[PDB]
Design a protein around this ligand. Sequence first.
Ligand SMILES: CCOc1ccc(C(C)=O)cc1-c1cc(NC(=O)c2ccco2)cc(-c2c(C)on(CC)c2=O)c1
Length: 114
Amino acid sequence: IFKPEELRQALMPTLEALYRQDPESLPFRQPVDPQLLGIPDYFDIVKNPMDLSTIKRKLDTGQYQEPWQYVDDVWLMFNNAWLYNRKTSRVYKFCSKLAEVFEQEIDPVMQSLG
Ligand SMILES: CCOc1ccc(C(C)=O)cc1-c1cc(NC(=O)c2ccco2)cc(-c2c(C)on(CC)c2=O)c1
């Protein structure tokens, strides 16, 4: 069992590492609005959307019961972007950079938790 403050203290640095990536985190900081972005086909392909602001709010307000729920949401965000965007596209490459950063950061944090 995990207290929400314990999860926030341990996991927020891994999320901050993603936010720190500029420009690579810019497609992921807010939820995708297909109308604003001019990609109205998005929700036909991405049925379970996820973004950094949602993950941050969940961590801030205690909505995760255990750390693998947070890890699941981060990977859901990455997988959505790799599914929707073409392999040669800017956003796909940005996602791959974030995933490389996350893999480096999450491993020892989960070991300390556990
Ligand atoms: C239509 C192509 O855009 C996308 C396509 C797909 C996806 C996904 C996540 O699958 C995301 C984006 C996307 C990209 C960028 N920026 C750059 O790519 C960039 C910045 C600098 C160089 O490149 C910003 C935003 C964005 C958001 C989410 O919220 N806002 C204002 C709140 C935004 O501006 C969204």
